[PDB]
Design a protein around this nucleic acid. Structure first.
Ligand code: FES
Ligand SMILES: [K+]
Ligand SMILES: [K+]
Ligand SMILES: [K+]
Ligand SMILES: [K+]
Ligand SMILES: [K+]
Ligand SMILES: [K+]
Ligand SMILES: [Mg+2]
Ligand SMILES: [Mg+2]
Ligand SMILES: [Mg+2]
Ligand SMILES: [Mg+2]
Ligand SMILES: [Mg+2]
Ligand SMILES: [Mg+2]
Ligand SMILES: [Mg+2]
Ligand SMILES: [Mg+2]
Ligand SMILES: [Mg+2]
Ligand SMILES: [Mg+2]
Ligand SMILES: [Mg+2]
Ligand SMILES: [Mg+2]
Ligand SMILES: [Mg+2]
Ligand SMILES: [Mg+2]
Ligand SMILES: [Mg+2]
Ligand SMILES: [Mg+2]
Ligand SMILES: [Mg+2]
Ligand SMILES: [Mg+2]
Ligand SMILES: [Mg+2]
Lengths: 65, 108, 170, 70, 113
RNA sequence: ACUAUGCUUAGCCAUAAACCUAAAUAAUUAAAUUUAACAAAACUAUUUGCCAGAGAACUACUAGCCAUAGCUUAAAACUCAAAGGAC
RNA sequence: AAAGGUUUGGUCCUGGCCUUAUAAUUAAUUAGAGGUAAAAUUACACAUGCAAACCUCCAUAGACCGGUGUAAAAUCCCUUAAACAUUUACUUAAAAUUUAAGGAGAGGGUAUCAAGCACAUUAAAAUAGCUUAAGACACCUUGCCUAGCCACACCCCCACGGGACUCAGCAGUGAUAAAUAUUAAGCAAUAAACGAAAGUUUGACUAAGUUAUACCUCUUAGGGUUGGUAAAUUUCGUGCCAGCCACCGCGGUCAUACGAU
């Protein structure tokens, strides 16, 4: 917050990685970690399907043209 | 509390005003089911005249009958009001003398 | 006992004593001050005593304060045109700071008086209506006018009940 | 004086009551955890079905987190 | 060249996040009067701002200009200026680099570097 | 008389009147302050946590936990006109 | 709050409850008339009558007034933009009235509702982000912003469709409830609709009817209370019985506390 230039050299030379404090504290327990994993997985699957549909839709349009 | 803590909390949280035997109503009408005696808690010593009634709300309550002498019987209709009988525990209703079947105490 | 130091700062009379009413151009006032030092005492007192009064009279101006970011305290105003007015308040008393900002970016007494009169243009004393908006609800309140029938009974001949009876008699 | 005696006497009557009905409480718990697991599974099924998936994500099996896994 | 409808034509805040592409999440604070206590407290608001050059870093004070048309649901401002860079502040009064309440370069000197 | 146990090596449990029954920090000793009393002289400021009659209740339910007769979190109905503290 | 009563063997402290003030509804007892204001158990079901016409045909109106508080944390305040099923001027500019998108700030309860699970940005379509203990999400409750505003209009949030098929217009009825206004008169005034207009219509409204619910002016007097708090008791009966109290309490033979007087 005061001398960024010295900060960068100090971290590079001393080999210390600095991570910024996270804005929000995240609770952790078995129920949360299991639901949070599915929610990420469900989202990815929905987006993967959309990408496939877009390619097929574009491919059909290209053939018509 | 500090001014920052008073700000984050605001005015005191207020428990809601739970209703009593009349359910926040001036009077209720009930049908007598039984007439019995209740014994006041010691040190009081008496045979207080009470009755069970089925109120219009649908619940059943025990009501003290005031006055010297009543003619109430089963299936009679009465107008009950609030007001607890201090010596009688659990008796939170009283019958109104002079309304429906219940009549004014008979001055004799 | 009211909590905090100088609890008079938390009274409506004190908040209303402020005299700095900014021009419509003023949009933001950043306050950069240091918590330790000797030349920044007036700046610290200005944040303690004066910033509440300024915000009270200028509710729509964003006052954001930063601490110990620079060697000296200063004030920077951001105007709607895009201009930035920097003020240096080092070695300056809190009273001096208020007078300086009042001069450069404060509305004059003449302008404020005109706005007050314009605000009250639609209030008329003669208008009748509820007490919240008007002096008198009804003309019966006025002296010499026919009084309200509720307070004073009307003559029988002025009553519809009586007039209807005569028409039937006719 | 009588306030710790009453906590002691109240606490004494709870430990006795728990002892008398210890076996019943065990069967209550095993059933409360089973309902706690079904509620967990159903809540996870609601998520993917609402998102529009017709089957749970590939290679996903709801973890059994309330069973005697430890 | 009509201006935006939003009240916040000009807002100052601190960059609390920069993980979105070309967008910086900024936290502004305003003073709001507590009516019971008659004391001012800080109410903070989040503003998404368009950072075209991705020149923003967490912790730096910035000035945002209201966009004429909202770029998206939440991006209704752009990065007008970086008032203070995080760790790279330049004193407005003297113009010399500073590191807190101290001068990295004395104001008496004239390095012109 | 003798066992679990107290010991060692690995884990687990997370409980005490875990109490100096005193949150931390910087002041001041005069403000004509025994400002109840008793403890430990009093008192100002700052920040956070906590409290709002007693019993019901170190309870019921809820969630988390290697804990499964467990711990932490923690009500209401209902009852009383007191409960409680220091002398 | 100018306070008071009530923990004890006693004192002090702490702390709750209750008393005294003010108002609305209902009930007991009681009551003359007059003027005024208000009218209110119920989004439960409704017999009957009426509540929207006007007018040289076209149109205009019946989108209002009136009613209820259904739903919803629903809102307030403020900004921008555009319209109107409009008006009046110009053939183009001033209003009233709305609509849509927004946001300086403010805006009910439960945190034993602590995570939400797509809620983000970029604009080659990639990045992995968005809200959240400064209270997200979930649930519960409530009309509020009061010259008035908002929502609703038999029910299915809506109303193509369907259904259990219409007074939450005025009056009135059934059921229900502690809760009880006329199945009334007039379009003369004001307001609205229509017409160029004389005019017509209106359960809006106006003038009445009804009711101690309130106020005012008067005239009869009734109601409660009388241990303490807290103004005020004589005789007799009763004898821990009958009864009484808001709190403390009273009654076992001299009861100012119960009943009569
Ligand atoms: S209030 Fe004016 S005549 Fe009644
Ligand atoms: K007794
Ligand atoms: K007291
Ligand atoms: K006591
Ligand atoms: K509806
Ligand atoms: K008329
Ligand atoms: K008497
Ligand atoms: Mg051994
Ligand atoms: Mg000790
Ligand atoms: Mg314990
Ligand atoms: Mg337990
Ligand atoms: Mg438990
Ligand atoms: Mg309780
Ligand atoms: Mg009545
Ligand atoms: Mg209306
Ligand atoms: Mg409702
Ligand atoms: Mg619970
Ligand atoms: Mg109906
Ligand atoms: Mg409908
Ligand atoms: Mg009707
Ligand atoms: Mg109708
Ligand atoms: Mg009535
Ligand atoms: Mg006309
Ligand atoms: Mg006697
Ligand atoms: Mg008495
Ligand atoms: Mg007597």
């Amino acid at each position: 917050q005061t001398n960024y230039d010295v900060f960068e050299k100090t971290c590079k030379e001393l080999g210390v990685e600095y991570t910024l404090p996270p804005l929000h504290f995240q609770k952790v327990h078995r129920r949360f970690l299991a639901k949070k994993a599915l929610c990420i997985r469900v989202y990815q699957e929905v987006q993967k399907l959309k990408k496939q549909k877009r390619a097929l839709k574009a491919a059909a349009a290209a053939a018509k043209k | 509390a500090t001014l920052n803590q008073m700000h984050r909390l605001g005015p005191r949280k207020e428990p809601p005003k739970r209703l009593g035997p009349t359910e926040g109503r001036p009077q209720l009408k009930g049908v007598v089911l039984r007439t019995f005696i209740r014994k006041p808690k010691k040190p009081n010593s008496a045979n207080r005249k009470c009755c069970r009634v089925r109120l219009s709300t649908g619940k059943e309550a025990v009501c003290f009958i005031p006055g010297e002498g009543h003619t109430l019987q089963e299936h009679h209709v009465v107008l009950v009001e609030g007001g607890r009988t201090q010596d009688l525990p659990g008796v939170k209703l009283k019958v109104v003398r002079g309304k429906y079947d219940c009549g004014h105490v008979q001055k004799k | 006992p009211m909590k905090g130091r100088f609890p008079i700062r938390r009274t409506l009379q004190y908040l209303g004593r402020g005299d700095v009413v900014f021009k419509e151009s003023v949009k933001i006032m950043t306050v950069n001050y240091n918590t330790y030092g000797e030349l920044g005492e007036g700046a610290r007192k200005f944040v303690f005593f004066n910033i509440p009064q300024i915000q009270y009279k200028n509710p729509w101006v964003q006052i954001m304060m930063f601490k110990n970011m620079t060697p000296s305290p200063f004030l920077r105003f951001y105007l709607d045109s895009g201009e930035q007015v920097l003020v240096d308040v080092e070695t300056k008393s809190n009273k001096e700071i208020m007078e300086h900002i009042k001069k450069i970016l404060g509305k004059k007494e003449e302008t404020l008086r005109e706005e007050e009169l314009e605000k009250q243009q639609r209030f008329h004393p003669g208008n009748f209506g509820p007490r919240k908006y008007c002096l008198r609800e009804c003309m019966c309140e006025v002296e010499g006018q026919v009084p309200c029938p509720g307070l004073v009974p009307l003559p029988k001949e002025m009553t519809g009940k009586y007039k209807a009876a005569l028409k039937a008699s006719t | 004086v009588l306030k710790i005696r009453r906590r002691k006497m109240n606490h004494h009557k709870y430990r006795k009551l728990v002892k008398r009905t210890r076996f019943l409480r065990r069967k209550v718990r095993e059933g409360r955890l089973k309902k706690k697991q079904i509620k967990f599974e159903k809540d996870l099924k609601r998520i993917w079905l609402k998102a529009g998936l017709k089957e749970a994500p590939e290679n996903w099996q709801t973890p059994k987190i309330y069973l005697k896994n430890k | 060249i009509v201006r935006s409808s939003v009240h916040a034509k000009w807002v100052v805040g601190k960059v609390i996040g920069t993980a979105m592409i070309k967008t910086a999440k900024v936290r502004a604070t305003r003073l709001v009067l507590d009516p019971y206590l008659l004391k001012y407290f800080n109410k903070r608001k989040t503003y998404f701002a368009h950072d075209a050059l991705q020149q923003c870093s967490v912790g730096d004070i910035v000035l945002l200009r209201a966009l004429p048309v909202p770029r998206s649901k939440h991006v209704k401002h752009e990065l007008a200026e970086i008032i203070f860079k995080v760790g790279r502040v330049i004193d407005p009064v003297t113009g010399k680099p500073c590191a807190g309440t101290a001068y990295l370069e004395s104001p008496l000197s004239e390095p012109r570097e």
